[PDB]
Design a protein around this ligand. Structure first.
Ligand SMILES: [Cs+]
Lengths: 86, 87
């Protein structure tokens, strides 16, 4: 989506399916590949960790902040948003 | 520690855990079984967050994590400081 891509700070948006394959991206192919597979295994770990801590709970949102950027993830497929640090 | 009390007392906060590099809880404001519910499972997840940031960009570093769920929210800052709170 254009509106979300256009927000201050946002660098790109990737939608990946349940197997981690990008089904939509606003980014170039190499960068989409830089992120999709690596983010997929990390997202599976976030989801399984929430459930190992409380079987009746569910992951709804993730924010990973680093020195250079920030990544948000929302389950729905997974929506991945890459952006400047907030 | 005084800062732990101040942080524990914030609206929404349920507890605070400090784990070392091996994921051993070295400090906690929570009961022992809850501290154990979280410390081991969180340590594994935190190593994965840190290694993922670096696999994506070898020159980057994880600085903060927020994991939000239906029932609660967990924040982590690199020791690792773990804060469990209401959504
Ligand atoms: Cs933008």
């Amino acid at each position: 989506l254009k509106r979300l891509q256009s927000q201050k700070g946002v660098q790109g948006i990737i939608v990946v399916n349940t197997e981690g394959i990008p089904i939509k991206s606003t980014m170039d192919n190499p960068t989409t590949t830089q992120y999709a597979s690596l983010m997929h295994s990390f997202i599976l770990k976030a989801r399984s960790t929430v459930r190992d801590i409380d079987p009746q709970n569910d992951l709804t949102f993730l924010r990973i902040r680093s020195k250079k950027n920030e990544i948000m993830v929302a389950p729905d497929y997974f929506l991945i948003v890459i952006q400047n640090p907030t």
